[PDB]
């Protein structure tokens, strides 16, 4: 279900194995109805903050080639809007560190938060309104839907909240037809690999493939 997408649209891809080493999976429930829903280990605010810092730092990774400063936006896939395509489940919140702490409830209820936006987005990735009291769009920062099966793993059947993996993919232009652009793309890739493989954060376990 994963390699089908990478052979129909893509472009070289940068992907990381992500799994929560310390925390565990907690419980939640949708507001109006919908029984009980458990949320996977990488789905806790005590740990969710860290994975977004890693991705934002990756977007800010720069590499030196000749007299130019090569950024991700120079070589990334931007289908539209110059925002790079980010196949990550954090993209349901438009990839901001001041947004994934949001709240709407009161001293009685919590109508909507990251949880309820999570459950709706994985069912309607292309929606511009989560139909909750927060009306937060599910579309990514690059203007396209984020299919949860490409950004989650370790879950059973369609219970994506039970996923133990949060898959992040960075599509990068292959530049097979342009050697000069390929050299700049490879320069950024070398910096990206070194930064990721030595990311000092005990709350996260990061590898490749």
């Amino acid at each position: 279900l994963e390699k089908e997408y990478f052979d129909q649209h893509f472009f070289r891809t940068e992907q990381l194995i992500i799994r929560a080493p310390l925390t565990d999976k907690h419980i939640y429930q949708p507001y109006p109805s919908g029984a009980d829903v458990p949320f996977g280990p990488p789905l806790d605010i005590q740990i969710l903050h860290q994975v977004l810092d890693l991705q934002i730092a990756i977007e800010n990774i720069t590499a030196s080639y000749d007299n130019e400063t090569v950024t991700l936006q120079d070589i990334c896939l931007a289908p539209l809007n110059t925002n790079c395509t980010i196949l990550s489940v954090l993209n349901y919140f438009q990839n901001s560190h001041s947004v994934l702490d949001h709240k709407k409830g009161d001293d009685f209820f919590v109508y909507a938060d990251y949880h309820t936006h999570f459950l709706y987005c994985v069912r309607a990735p292309a929606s511009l309104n989560d139909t909750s009291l927060l009306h937060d769009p599910c579309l990514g920062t690059f203007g396209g839907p984020v299919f949860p099966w490409l950004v989650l793993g370790g879950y059973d059947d369609q219970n994506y909240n039970n996923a133990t993996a949060l898959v992040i993919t960075f599509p990068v232009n292959n530049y097979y037809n342009d050697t000069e652009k390929l050299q700049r793309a490879q320069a950024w890739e070398k910096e990206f690999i070194n930064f990721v493989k030595n990311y000092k954060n005990p709350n996260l376990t990061i590898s490749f493939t």
């Binding site: 907690h26 939640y28 429930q29 507001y31 109006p32 109805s33 409830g105 009161d106 001293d107 009685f108 209820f109 919590v110 109508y111 009291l133």
Partner: protein, 156 residues
């Protein structure tokens, strides 16, 4: 001190249990009545997140409950099951002998998670939460309730 209404020939008179002298004879305990009138019918606005602004939590006040004999059609009832941010339940289980409001038009179900500063949830206006012929000052879990207040009557 507690006002008492005397219903004589479809007209209401407000008096007490001392100021009345006689010619208002009370013949049996049957004609002493306690009625609970709904508060939604006194000009309020009730949604599920817009009626939560009328009640909140407090600690230190023990709960109390009274009985009312006759009630009124509730236009909007509520059924709440609240759980702490990482806890079990905010609202207490209903005490034995308490059922839901007999006659509800529409019921606003809700099972949610939220913060709960305080042991019990009281009304922020002084009214009661009406249950099946029992009116209390707190909110119990999984039981249909309407917000109202009790009046005491003598009927001729």
């Amino acid at each position: 001190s507690m006002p008492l209404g005397v219903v004589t020939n479809s007209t209401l008179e407000v008096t007490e249990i001392d100021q009345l002298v006689c010619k208002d004879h009370l013949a049996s305990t049957d004609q002493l009545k306690s009625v609970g009138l709904n508060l939604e019918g006194s000009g309020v606005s009730t949604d599920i997140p817009s009626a939560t602004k009328r009640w909140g939590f407090r600690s230190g006040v023990p709960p109390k409950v009274v009985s009312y004999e006759a009630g009124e059609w509730a236009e909007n009832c509520y059924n709440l099951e609240i759980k702490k941010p990482d806890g079990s339940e905010c609202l207490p289980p209903p005490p034995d002998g308490v059922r839901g409001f007999p006659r509800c038009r529409y019921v606003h179900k809700a099972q949610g998670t939220g913060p709960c500063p305080g042991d019990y949830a009281f009304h922020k206006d002084g009214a009661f939460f009406l249950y099946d012929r029992l009116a209390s000052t707190v909110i119990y879990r999984g039981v249909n309730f309407a917000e109202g207040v009790i009046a005491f009557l003598i009927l001729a």
